RNA sequence: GGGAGGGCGCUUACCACUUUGUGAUUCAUGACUGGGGUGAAGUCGUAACAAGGUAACCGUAGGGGAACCUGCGGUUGGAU
């Protein structure tokens, strides 16, 4: 890996794209004309790419590609013309600059963008067995930081009841109070599937939830053809296409939105609400904890700031230094 | 006169082909699979080598979606 050699190399790969696009036959013979595509499936060593034509091609990925991931739309080739026609045979000559995308946190292994070109990131979730706002709280900051739109969807609502929902919806009202988008539904039950469908209308976004939040239900509910197995018990990079438009990078991980450490002054910018809680405090450097005359504290224990949000926000900062 | 004798002849014995059984051996066919070979992922995890960050390892039990867990016995192939 060579930042320098990597650099000079970058320019080369870039030119290769524009140069190849200039026009074809000089390129030719083994492979066919270049075309655009996005990465639906990751074969570790291969990738399924959907072409402009709309037909997916499993392709090789020339070493010259530092990396690739799902949600990556860009130029591509298959082998020849003839070669795609017997058996999905294609190769990815180069990629495009991911306009909108996000990565996963990790521990040893470094942050890796999960998907690119995202208009909205709908946080799944599920009532079974029990939610944890924390997971959603940390996710809220991510959506703000990548400047992506967030949709929280309390799913599997059909599983709740009298003393079950009256505590679910309300408890989630927080999102409806601070201006967030949410739509209670139950894949098993197909309820509130109208609102979501419209929300996903003309947009490029995807859904990720925590361990077992009904991600397979919703993705399989909106549009499911010859493939409805991704439920079933409690268990587990392909970005599937939508029934009403939009795609959703599903890989068995993403739904488990962890939490990575970006900066120590950003955490305060995570929530817009803080725009009024970070005005005047007791200590110029008051981390908002046990200071005398704080602002965020005087608001929390005052009824305006949701206590639950305080504990979660404070825990997030203590989670980073966990390294 | 003929006669012995022989052939023709039938039949007997051995038995070739081959049908009933009875199976034995392989070729294939295929409902169905263990578990192998690969790596430019996600996780969900911190597993082995440090005291590696549930000493390790061995037998075997029960247990557990995932590496693993654990009872039981054993050891020195475990930092101080
Ligand atoms: O059992 C299955 C479901 O039957 C059930 N399930 C899904 N939707 C619903 C629902 O609406 N209601 C109920 N009761 N169960 C549901 O919830 C479980 C999870 O469904 P999955 O589709 O696999 O969820 P992910 O795809 O998000 N998971 P990963 O990110 O790891 O791929
Ligand atoms: Zn303060």
Swiss-Prot record:
Domain CP-type G per the UniProt entry, residue ranges: 99-257
UniProt note: phenotype after gene disruption: Reduced growth rate, reduced 70S ribosomes, accumulation of 17S rRNA (the precursor of 16S rRNA). Ribosomal proteins uS2 and bS21 not found in 30S subunits, decreased uS3 and RbfA in 30S subunits, distortion of rRNA helix 44 near the decoding center. The phenotype is partially suppressed by overexpression of a number of genes involved in ribosome function, including infB, era and ksgA. Double rbfA-rsgA deletion mutants have the same phenotype as single mutants.
Region (Disordered): 1-28
GO cellular component annotations of the record: cytosol
Residues engaged in binding Zn(2+): 281, 286, 288, 294
Region described as Necessary for GMP-PNP-dependent association with the 30S ribosomal subunit: 1-15
Needed cofactors: Zn(2+)
Keyword Hydrolase on entry: yes
GO BP annotation list: ribosomal small subunit assembly; ribosomal small subunit biogenesis
UniProt cross-references to Pfam families, sorted A to Z: RsgA_GTPase
Compartments it resides in: Cytoplasm
Keywords: Cytoplasm, GTP-binding, Hydrolase, Metal-binding, Nucleotide-binding, Ribosome biogenesis, RNA-binding, rRNA-binding, Zinc
GO molecular function ontology, one term from the record: guanosine tetraphosphate binding
Cofactor note: Binds 1 zinc ion per subunit.
Keyword Zinc among record annotations: yes
Binding positions for GTP per the UniProt entry: 155-158, 209-217
EC number: 3.6.1.-
Enzyme class: hydrolase
Gene3D superfamilies for this protein: Nucleic acid-binding proteins (2.40.50.140), P-loop containing nucleotide triphosphate hydrolases (3.40.50.300), Probable gtpase engc, domain 3 (1.10.40.50)
Annotated region described as Required for binding to mature and immature 30S ribosomes, given as residue ranges: 271-303
Record note on quaternary structure: Monomer. All of the protein is associated with ribosomes; the ratio is substoichiometric at 1:200 RsgA/ribosome. Association is tightest with the 30S subunit in the presence of the non-hydrolyzable GTP analog GMP-PNP. 2 cryoelectron microscopy (cryo-EM) structures in complex with 30S ribosomes have been resolved; the protein is determined to bind to different but partially overlapping regions of the 30S ribosomal subunit. One cryo-EM study suggests it contacts ribosomal proteins uS3, uS12 and uS13 as well as 16S rRNA.
Function description: One of at least 4 proteins (Era, RbfA, RimM and RsgA/YjeQ) that assist in the late maturation steps of the functional core of the 30S ribosomal subunit. Binds the 30S subunit contacting the head, platform, and rRNA helix 44, which may assist the last maturation stages. Removes RbfA from mature, but not immature 30S ribosomes in a GTP-dependent manner; 95% removal in the presence of GTP, 90% removal in GMP-PNP and 65% removal in the presence of GDP. Circulary permuted GTPase that catalyzes rapid hydrolysis of GTP with a slow catalytic turnover.
Domain notes: Has 3 domains; an N-terminal OB-like domain (about residues 1-100), a central, circularly permutated GTPase module (residues 104-270) and the C-terminal zinc-finger domain (residues 280 to 350). The C-terminal domain has 2 regions; the zinc-binding domain (residues 287-319) is required for binding to 30S ribosomes while the extreme C-terminus (residues 320-350) helps remove RbfA from the mature 30S subunit.
Protein name (database record): Small ribosomal subunit biogenesis GTPase RsgA
